[model samples]
Target: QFAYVYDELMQDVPYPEWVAWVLEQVEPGKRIADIGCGTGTATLLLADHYEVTGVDLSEEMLEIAQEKAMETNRHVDFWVQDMRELELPEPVDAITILCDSLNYLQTEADVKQTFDSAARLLTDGGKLLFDVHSPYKMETLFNGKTYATHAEQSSYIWFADPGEEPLSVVHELTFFIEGEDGRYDRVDETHHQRTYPPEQYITWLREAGFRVCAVTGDFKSDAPTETAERIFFVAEKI
Candidate 1:
């Protein structure tokens, strides 16, 4: 599995810029929780300003995240958690589920549960910022697509096959990580993701007792165009 080489596999992601966008939306020194903090890339970045804790479903990812925190002489708490069934004893000022992580939920109920959990964990007036792949992105870019790339330490073949359900795709990834022995290790992973319309997400947020604050696309302040790739939502608990 890519628990070991996940960083090399996802080396091209713009973590710094993405986290900067997040920081702009919220104030510093607030208690924050990063849901789906894979390998703590964004988690560590958020730690620069806020009292942050990273939560993820993968312990392997958390292990590397912890190692990186120690190596960088940074301090952050890491937790193993499932977004749909999140349970936190202490409340936070804000919660973030970014990087299209919401698409990983296969059903509306799952997303609703996640929103409910976020509502339960947030203080009054606390915010929840998250992003999801737009339906246009799934139909235009991901559906029936095959993408491959080579990196300094790894190469990957990626297939995005559409599912029977609308706005659903199965990502099949095969990565070859170069080893010290001059050989390569082949790792295969498959992920399923689905996205809904903006109205659906807004509905669920409202049902979870959150007031929808803003909706933007591609990290901009404007509304989503017909072809926007990512859609961001800012909701606050009332």
Candidate 2:
């Protein structure tokens, strides 16, 4: 997948909410790993208030992340590594996977590997936090949908296909990026993202050895009522 730190439409992602959640988990000056820290949005913000390390597999994303860290004058160790096979030099106090990055992996085995590796890097009583897309949203909102947009210089056509066997949706995206010379480059790729039931994530976390904390809503709400569109979780080492 050819992914970049595209601020294409000035999208307003809920990164501030993520920062607050991370800060609440780990105390100040404790080591933190920002897996899938795209463009250092979460890493840089968290580093301002704690000791942090940022890791990602995308060089383009890391390049932008390095630039952000340098410009902000923050001390953050940014590296290129796969999340499922990650191993840090030292045990950290916390690990985080925000912005729905966990769905990028194609299977549950990868997810368990990541959880095991994360548990191995914790400092005895460390915390792990992440978010997953709800299966409800996929089956209802994104299933069998096609949306097209045309703006001044940027336009995108999104296609979604739903499957019932494995309970997941397959997304194929083709972007037409307009260049300054009046030529557009059409980039195409198929992205596979998985949505699991909230209980399933808890089961996987406990199976990987972390005591399940709580599965909250998009923000730090205690209510798991029907209003929870995104699932956020906190698991502690037993």
Candidate 3:
């Protein structure tokens, strides 16, 4: 309902841009943890480049990832877990949470907790790359951005509310899903997202025990502008 709800609705966006950036930060044979991994998009993308583990909040999404892994004969560990609080079996060389997944976090405390969690899961000198929505994208285009299909039985509505910051957007969602038996279910959630000045992110990362490496224009752009919806952060652990 809000942005893209079902995994099916997620237009299979490629990761060439983001993956290429991650490659610069990670060496071959490194272990990369794909946090908030949806349908294992980043998982599969990183498979040939690095040993990978994909963690997601939804089992439904992980199921798709697992099925795809079997189909491709790629060995990726897909775990059902939340990102805000995670305990990985071992430290990883790099961690990625791309595709604007941080927008799903409603509060700063959640973001801090997630960053702190990653700090513990990373090896010394390990890096974390992630992205967040630009204030314009969420406040303008994302909320109430609607499209539908007859092939699926879910009509959705999206609404955006302003936060204390001019760049903040609170997403209100409602989804109506139809089952094969003709029964329909209702789903609802409220997500708050924000866009900060690049310097603010640098400060937050530093405060969370990370070395601010670079503030790229986006996952794909080495020189990203503030207007870009996806702001990629490349940070290293001390």
Candidate 4:
């Protein structure tokens, strides 16, 4: 299954930088909810400093996250829930949706629903931090690209094509994993991602009762340039 190879494929992700930026913005020991927390890489990193909860739509991914939490001897909560309909027993001090997770939503309404849910789940003055693939990345990096990678026991061929909508991409992945019997099992998956301009996200965030504080490029504190691959947003509940 894709869940098994997810971490291996994502080994190059800069989780420490993401966590460091988050730590710079949020106070330690505050309750934090990481939405769309696939496999809890960043979630676990945040757990070391914050009372963290990892939420994802996939039960399999949440199971992996729970296993990692146990192995690391960290007390954290993992929930299988959709970001658009998130609910928590108590309000958290901060909410995060990192690693371009928000781009998975197909529509503006879906993104707004998630923002509303985040606003409702956070306390007054709570912060919401998230990032999305920039338009430049979609056009230049992902559009019509084919990437392949090989590991010790598994390998993958990934293709990215432009979607029907603007700034949208459809990713097709074919993975082959070796079994104990020295046979290879093939698994295929397709994922669609869409991103809008930063102004559009800011408009939706404001409508969802958040004050957009900062919009930075890639991990830097300054505004995004024309070619910035990732755009990070920091917002506060009003």
Candidate 2: how large is its RMSD? 2.4
lDDT, candidates in the order shown: 0.88, 0.79, 0.77, 0.94
Which is the better candidate, 1 or 3, if ranked by lDDT? Answer: 1
lDDT of 1 by residue, 1-238 (tens): 3575668766878888678777877899998999998898888989998998989999999999999999998899899999988887777899999798778888878999999999889878999999899999999889789988888778889999888799999999998998889799998999999999999999999999999999989978899999999999999999
- List model 3 lDDT by residue over 1-238, tens digit each: 3223455444445567677877887897899899888888668878989999999898888888888889999999999989998878976898888877866776667878888998989978999988777655755676555544332666556676676655777677677777679987778777667766667677878888999887776555475665676677889998
Weakest 10 consecutive residues of candidate 2 by summed lDDT: 1-10
The local lDDT score (0 to 100) that residue 179 gets in candidate 1 is: 89
For candidate 2, the lDDT comes to 0.79
Question: TM per model?
Answer: 0.96, 0.89, 0.81, 0.98
Distance from true location, Cα of 44 in model 2, Å: 1.8
TM-score of candidate 4 relative to the true fold:
0.98
Which 10 consecutive positions of candidate 3 have the poorest summed lDDT? 1-10
Model 2, residue 16: displacement in angstroms?
0.5
lDDT for 59 in candidate 1 is: 92
Of 2 and 4, the candidate ranking higher by TM-score: 4
Q: What ranking of all candidate models by lDDT puts the best one first?
A: 4, 1, 2, 3
Model 3 CA lDDT for position 164: 62
* Native-to-model Cα distance after best TM-score fit, residue 49 in candidate 3, in Å: 1.7
Backbone steric clashes in candidate 4, count: 0
Q: Which of the numbered candidates is closest to the native, going by highest TM-score?
A: 4
